[PDB]
Amino acid sequence: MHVFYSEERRGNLLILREGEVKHFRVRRIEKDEEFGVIHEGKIYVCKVRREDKREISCEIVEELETKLPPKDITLYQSVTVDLKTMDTIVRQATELGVLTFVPIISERSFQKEEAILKKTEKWKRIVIEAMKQSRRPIPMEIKKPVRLSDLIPESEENIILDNFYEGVKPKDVNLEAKTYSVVVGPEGGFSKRESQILREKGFKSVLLEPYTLRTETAVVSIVSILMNF
Amino acid sequence: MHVFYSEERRGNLLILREGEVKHFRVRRIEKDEEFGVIHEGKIYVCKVRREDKREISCEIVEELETKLPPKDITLYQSVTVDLKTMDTIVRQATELGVLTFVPIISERSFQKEEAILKKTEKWKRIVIEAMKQSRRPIPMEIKKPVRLSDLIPESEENIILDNFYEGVKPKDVNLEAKTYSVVVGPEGGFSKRESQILREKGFKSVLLEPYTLRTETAVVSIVSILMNF
Ligand SMILES: C[S@@+](CC[C@H](N)C(=O)[O-])C[C@H]1O[C@@H](n2cnc3c(N)ncnc32)[C@H](O)[C@@H]1O
Numbered sequence A, B: 001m002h003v004f005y006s007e008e009r010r011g012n013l014l015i016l017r018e019g020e021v022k023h024f025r026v027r028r029i030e031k032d033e034e035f036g037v038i039h040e041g042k043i044y045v046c047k048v049r050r051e052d053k054r055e056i057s058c059e060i061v062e063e064l065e066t067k068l069p070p071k072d073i074t075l076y077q078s079v080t081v082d083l084k085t086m087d088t089i090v091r092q093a094t095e096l097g098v099l100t101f102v103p104i105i106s107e108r109s110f111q112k113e114e115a116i117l118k119k120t121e122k123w124k125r126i127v128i129e130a131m132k133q134s135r136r137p138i139p140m141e142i143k144k145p146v147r148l149s150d151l152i153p154e155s156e157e158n159i160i161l162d163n164f165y166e167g168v169k170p171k172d173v174n175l176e177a178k179t180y181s182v183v184v185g186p187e188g189g190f191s192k193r194e195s196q197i198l199r200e201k202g203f204k205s206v207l208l209e210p211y212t213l214r215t216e217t218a219v220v221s222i223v224s225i226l227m228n229f
């Protein structure tokens, strides 16, 4: 079943707009063909009603039960100097079930906050596309940027991924925790001074084996481990 | 320090040739600056001996401590219909430590064998670049394409990643195995017909939580779990 996204409800009809109208057209949906539509935290099985140029209305047939991630993870991602890489990180974090995404400004990360705020518009659209593809009805919230220097661990388990520090193995982490905070560096990584402060604050430094990975690969590695164990 | 790749040694000198010389010059190495050079399974610390027009000789001054992957993994990757995606999978599999990469032709995968063979040339270049960036001294072999119907469970643990089958959790597979065979599907996944055959042949079906991932995301997810546990 194809899945679409809506942020507009009119009675018992879910409305598709702009990009979703185009996506709907591409799928060449049949008159009585059922499809899913994500709206306000749930996936609704629907059938088509109106097919117009700037709008597709979908009749709600059945409201499905929403499956939530087994763990509540907040990813504090140092913005990559190559902004394009964030498209992948945001997409994959969404697929994996991460609940909250916080862009971080660190010593070696992208530095322009204004550009980060603008790019966030695109990142939110990427989250929506990933939600449709992964059949994830709950959004991944993208928050305003925070500076690494101001972070304070507050989750049940708090981790800093660092290839430059002889940290602990993933299995040494509290895998029974239900809430996590994970801090990941940009291409250049974390400076020794930056990471030291984070470790002193209470972030457990984790080292993935056996090699140093690119930022996006490290994100999926740690999140997949935490989400599945 | 920067790391380079060589397949030619002359006495105590490691030689960089072809495109590697261009790569070296792009890195703008300073006078007396030391750098690493991968050669036959080891990474040597070197300094420039002589720079020529199309080759650079590097004097070995020491040897870096290297580490091999803790697990021997063979990834059987159904070729994605979007061939570009394979560039990412090959690169990440290399970063993660996968030893052997085998492109597979399944019911819903890319079908042109001739095109797969052509792209393999690029995949081999990607492997070398990932080796340099991850400081991985051993290559990842990219084999000729084979059909899903011709796969055999040759490793200590043989797994098929399938979102369409209620398989077991990753933490429940044989994590004490030294060798693994991992089969991953294309964008459209595995048909019920072909997966049933693979399961009967001896492949253990694994289901990642909580949502359906894109192929590349699933690869990093399972490989990271196997390598770190
Ligand atoms: C590419 S790495 C740092 C640069 C890398 N050392 C290099 O020069 O190739 C970017 C980020 O990914 C994460 N990372 C990469 N490899 C890691 C590993 N093996 N263990 C833990 N974190 C890692 C860390 O958050 C790191 O700051």
Ligand SMILES: C[S@@+](CC[C@H](N)C(=O)[O-])C[C@H]1O[C@@H](n2cnc3c(N)ncnc32)[C@H](O)[C@@H]1O
Binding pocket: A133, A134, B161, B162, B163, B183, B184, B185, B186, B187, B188, B189, B190, B206, B207, B208, B209, B210, B211, B212, B213, B214, B215, B218
């Ligand atoms: C994109 S998935 C299959 C199509 C997907 N269900 C969809 O329609 O969006 C591609 C491949 O990634 C792997 N995969 C993705 N999610 C998975 C999961 N949750 N558990 C196990 N394997 C998964 C499987 O090998 C699958 O064949």
